[PDB]
Amino acid sequence: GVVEELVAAIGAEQVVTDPAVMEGYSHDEAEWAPYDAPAAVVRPRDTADVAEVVRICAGRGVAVVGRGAGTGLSGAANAGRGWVVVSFERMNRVLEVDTVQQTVTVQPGVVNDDLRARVAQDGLWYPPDPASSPWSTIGGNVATNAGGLCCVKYGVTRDYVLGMEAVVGSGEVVRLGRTTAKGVTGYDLAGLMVGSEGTLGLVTEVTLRLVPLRRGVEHTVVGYFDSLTDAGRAVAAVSAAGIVPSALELIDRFCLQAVDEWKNAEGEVLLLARSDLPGTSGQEEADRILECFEKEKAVYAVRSTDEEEAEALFQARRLAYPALERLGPLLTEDVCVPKARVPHMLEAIEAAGERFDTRIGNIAHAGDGNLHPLFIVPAGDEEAKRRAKQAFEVIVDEALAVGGTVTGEHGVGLLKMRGAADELGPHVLAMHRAVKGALDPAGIFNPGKVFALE
Amino acid sequence: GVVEELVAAIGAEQVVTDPAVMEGYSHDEAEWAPYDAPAAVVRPRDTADVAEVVRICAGRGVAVVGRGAGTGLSGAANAGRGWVVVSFERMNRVLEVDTVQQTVTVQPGVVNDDLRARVAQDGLWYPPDPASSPWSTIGGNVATNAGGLCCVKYGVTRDYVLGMEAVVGSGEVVRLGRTTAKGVTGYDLAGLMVGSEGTLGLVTEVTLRLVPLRRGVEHTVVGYFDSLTDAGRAVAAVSAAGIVPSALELIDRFCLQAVDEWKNMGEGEVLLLARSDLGQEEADRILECFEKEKAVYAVRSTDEEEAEALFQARRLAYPALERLGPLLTEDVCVPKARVPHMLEAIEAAGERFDTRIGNIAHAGDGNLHPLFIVPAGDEEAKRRAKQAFEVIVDEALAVGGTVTGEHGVGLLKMRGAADELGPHVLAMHRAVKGALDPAGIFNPGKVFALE
Ligand SMILES: Cc1cc2nc3c(=O)[nH]c(=O)nc-3n(C[C@H](O)[C@H](O)[C@H](O)COP(=O)(O)OP(=O)(O)OC[C@H]3O[C@@H](n4cnc5c(N)ncnc54)[C@H](O)[C@@H]3O)c2cc1C
Ligand SMILES: Cc1cc2nc3c(=O)[nH]c(=O)nc-3n(C[C@H](O)[C@H](O)[C@H](O)COP(=O)(O)OP(=O)(O)OC[C@H]3O[C@@H](n4cnc5c(N)ncnc54)[C@H](O)[C@@H]3O)c2cc1C
Ligand SMILES: [Fe+3]
């Protein structure tokens, strides 16, 4: 009688059982991630509803997986058979914007882009800008510690989580973290929630840190290359010069030429960089970045004196994944290695394609060494699927061999549990099982993702 | 028979038992914090030695309390009777400075200022600059999540900790966190160590993120006031102008006197020292904010040296007051909008309890440091200050602040810490510590109670 207690606790408008409606609430954009039919999909109204849902599911031992917008790429939000999917679509209000403290308090259902537009009205700015910003929730960004494009100079979500309110344990609603500028009272439990991917609790309200709007001119330094190796050597060349570019992205040829077909290519690798320093200070730095592209392999390495053709190339970098998803199933990998390993990793990925006869596109946050190789899977050719799945295990192990990480921003979820286990090791994993057990003694919060419990 | 197992594990020259020597290892600069004679003070050489100390005490259930430079202000490093003090004095080497990744790898025993000067050679910079930087260890800065003067614009220690290696549990050497620029694999166990004050493990190596050197001329904006109330409104003026200053510090009268009566170098009640890191247009905007409020000799300083001399008194305020006797310090942090109100509350706590309370605070972040000098022989004033101590704290939580901003709960703040966190959150601390420290040997009893 799980659905019976839920309706009797939070009403009927907050429980859904139509197998047709629950279809889309149990899987995210991560393809090949298994997902089964959940027992019911709850859409709570406020923290009180979530507290009751967690309490009921805790006693009955029913797995509950929180869901934001369902734009994950590792199946972290995917629901298991009989689970209770908690959709925060109804908790989508920005509660306050304190201009003196320069902080904002939002609900987990808020959309990233919507949040940024609201704070910009008060002259503030929320730096984190994931490619899925137009559709991802702040709840998801906090659960997966999502990153963005400008995170090479302003950090990721974790760098802006001051405090939060979460439902944990048997249904206790607690307020973790702080709201002032400095606080060390107790443990960093608020930070412990960030990057947990909903395996330790449920965030019902988060307090974010803000910054003044950049109200300025973005000097773009555009560069083209003919090889992923040379272009990789240039990104490291700028980082060795000691420059902190406000953006440094790589878009191979296969990816950029596809976006044109959708929305309507000087070289093989397009290295897009940009700086945001005011006045000539930025122009001086943007010029320095240009030389780094020219000194290395340089094809059409020119600084952009146009505020739109620059912005048009960057809008293509954002529409790279959705432009290729319409082109068929797309398997994506997220590794992050040291900046000095970008050339070795780029040439190592390209080599991985020839060994398994699999064409692999490349886009990566060159500023942080976070590579995103994307493979478009042709339908009908199972060997290509199999060859790409084994190449999947080569790029991962190769990134761990140079000292990288199995995931940089997308989250372990399900499609990266193998690599995550090899990176963390038995001791680190054992600590995860212990931590999750103390804060989730019922084992109901998204059990089985990131790491396994046995 | 515990000391014997230790000596039989890490040699004799790494174990000390002389009760005359262990004194300097069993208590920190936090006075009135309880401390007893430890069973031995271990000075490890490498992670292997630290691993042995943890394994031995884990099986025997002997409490171990890690110690850095002993500059804590809440008794976090104070040792309990029969404990084993692990001193990282020997682990004080900078292991690597990766200029391509722009990161540094340090051991816990390294001093803050030493780490900064080291990275300065390679054109890098470590922003976090606590007042005790010249003699505090990086191991301590990570356990307490220390702050500094520039943290109003560059964050605190936790904002630069990329990864670490620690000995947890029964003595397993694990490396938490990452070393790249981005990493989200699993939980943030590294961030969990930060601010734990050594209650979940022992950090033997930390990987900190760095930034390019400033390489510019700072625009210092010095300002004088005649009261903590009027000056408080000036601090809000910079906040009401959308200005993020690289530094904003406030010092009281008795603080300045002690600095001029010690260093003998040198007029106002409070002195707000502002600074920008852009730039003259911003420094000028702040100057007008001071004259907008009660302004005495408010001038946007162009002499970078004379201003730099003024910032030496702000950092030498506590060392200049400890020479005048026992100094009990409180560390509250409230929202910026409560700085003026909170300052007026501190003054009343003095009049109400007949206690002279000096004030220095990072007004830019709302981190207040009211310090009382306790005279010798007048125990009445000591207990009277303890009552104003409970009043200034409750007023910090009532207005939405926190019991501790940068110093840490330790021991002299566990009362307020419990009131702030609450039963639910406290029950979580005992649960977390239990999972990662099933033996309960890592500084047990501090921060929260293991009742
Ligand atoms: C086209 C595209 C571009 C992308 N670009 C980026 C990018 O640039 N950077 C990046 O980091 N990621 C990117 N992603 C994936 C992205 O990380 C996720 O979309 C984003 O992190 C959040 O999406 P979401 O709102 O759907 O969260 P969801 O997928 O719903 O949830 C993700 C995780 O968070 C947990 N969770 C959700 N809500 C809550 C809550 N309220 N409380 C606690 N836990 C919760 C979920 O259970 C799951 O574990 C992209 C995805 C797509 C499809
Ligand atoms: C004069 C003065 C000025 C100060 N100014 C500031 C300031 O501006 N900002 C600020 O934030 N703080 C300040 N402090 C206190 C500051 O927190 C300490 O100076 C700093 O935290 C480190 O001191 P320490 O290295 O002696 O740490 P210790 O006191 O030795 O240790 C502090 C806590 O950390 C734990 N710990 C230490 N090393 C390890 C380790 N290797 N692994 C695990 N746990 C460990 C200790 O056990 C203890 O719990 C000041 C202190 C003084 C005395
Ligand atoms: Fe991305």
Author numbering:
A (entry chain A): 3 to 266, 271 to 460
B (entry chain E): 3 to 268, 272 to 283, 288 to 460
From the reporting publication:
PdG-D-LDH exhibits a strong catalytic preference toward D-lactate and preferentially reduces quinones over cytochrome c or molecular oxygen. PdG-D-LDH exhibits the characteristic VAO/PCMH structural fold.
The crystal structure of the enzyme was solved both in the absence or presence of D-lactate (PdG-D-LDH–lactate), revealing a Cα root-mean-square deviation (RMSD) of 0.46 Å between the two structures. Moreover, a metal ion and the substrate D-lactate (in PdG-D-LDH-lactate complex) are clearly defined in the electron density. In D-LDH, D-lactate binds Fe(II) and interacts with H416, which likely abstracts a proton from the C2-OH, enabling hydride transfer to FAD’s N5. The C1 group coordinates iron and forms salt bridges with R323, while the C3 group engages in hydrophobic interactions with Y327, I369, and L380. In PdG-D-LDH, the C2-OH is 4.6 Å from FAD’s N5—too distant for efficient catalysis—unlike m-D-LDH, where this distance is 3.1 Å. Thus, the PdG-D-LDH–substrate complex likely lacks a catalytically competent geometry. The substrate-binding site comprises two distinct regions: one predominantly positively charged, defined by R323, H371, H378, and H416, is located near the C1-carboxyl and C2-hydroxyl groups of D-lactate.
